[PDB]
Design an enzyme around this catalytic site. Sequence first.
Site, PDB file in Angstrom:
ATOM      1  N   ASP A  35     -19.247   8.100  54.421  1.00  0.00           N
ATOM      2  CA  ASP A  35     -18.101   7.309  54.871  1.00  0.00           C
ATOM      3  C   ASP A  35     -18.239   5.873  54.391  1.00  0.00           C
ATOM      4  OD1 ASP A  35     -15.997   6.217  56.128  1.00  0.00           O
ATOM      5  OD2 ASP A  35     -16.833   6.348  58.155  1.00  0.00           O
ATOM      6  N   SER A 199      -5.056  -3.727  45.200  1.00  0.00           N
ATOM      7  CA  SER A 199      -4.332  -3.000  44.178  1.00  0.00           C
ATOM      8  C   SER A 199      -3.197  -3.859  43.609  1.00  0.00           C
ATOM      9  CB  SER A 199      -3.760  -1.695  44.774  1.00  0.00           C
ATOM     10  OG  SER A 199      -2.921  -1.026  43.906  1.00  0.00           O
TER      11      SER A 199
END
Length: 330
Positions: A35, A199
Amino acid sequence: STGSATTTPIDSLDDAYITPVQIGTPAQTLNLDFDTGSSDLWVFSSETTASEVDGQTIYTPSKSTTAKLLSGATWSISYGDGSSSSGDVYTDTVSVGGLTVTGQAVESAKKVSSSFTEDSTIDGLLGLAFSTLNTVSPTQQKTFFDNAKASLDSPVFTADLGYHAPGTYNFGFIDTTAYTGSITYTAVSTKQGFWEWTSTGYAVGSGTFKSTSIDGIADTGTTLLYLPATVVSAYWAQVSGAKSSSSVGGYVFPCSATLPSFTFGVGSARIVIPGDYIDFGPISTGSSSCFGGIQSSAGIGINIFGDVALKAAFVVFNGATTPTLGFASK
Ligand code: NA
């Protein structure tokens, strides 16, 4: 040193991935959920409340000649999905794919929430976010990566998750055979303890690319792609009959649909998520309403590039003095 381990989807939907991890001496092999959005290595154990264990493999520290209680240490964690676990702490030898760390904090669960109990395939978590998020008290502990780093050939790990197929976690090297083209690296903020990046925009299907900054985290422990409501609405507007369902808890779409791809930007590069990756199947068994793999992050307080996004890429988690992320197509 290096390590290399195969990661395997837990079910037909790729709801999570499990990777075998050796703990203790002699080795006890547990299948952990790696994770990159958390920083605790915790396991089902001989200490876990018996009624909360249903099929998981447990770590038994008393059977490990290298286990030692980390006296006074406790841990307690709550995840984004509402699940939680807590317990006490041992140090022990932990190996992943041939890479060994001695003295790793292994957080032994005394209590786990119902969603952990109900998932027989996940024996615990191995956190790969920054050690600043580790929950051990009163002495915070380091992640497996942070303890391994200085020994690695390169201070990196990579995630290569499969679509409906196994993939790989590598530690200490880039496998230049595992991706196509070049790797585009992008800046990371560690201020919230995550692999947080920005992004450069998105496209839906064959549509034009929208240049827009989307801050979010690269999180292998989250199944879906959570993005701003504007982006998510623009995606599902391209699917006839898709709608946001308050009763189901997100966007659903007709199981008869063919889904469009979704592209996200990494600098000037582009990662394309095929439409099929966005199908999470019937909302309940036998339903013709299917659950979407792109959902709104509104109310979560962060955008999450979970497995839907990451499995479309070869992802480099660069733990150099200034961390960065890298993405390549594959
Ligand atoms: Na669900």
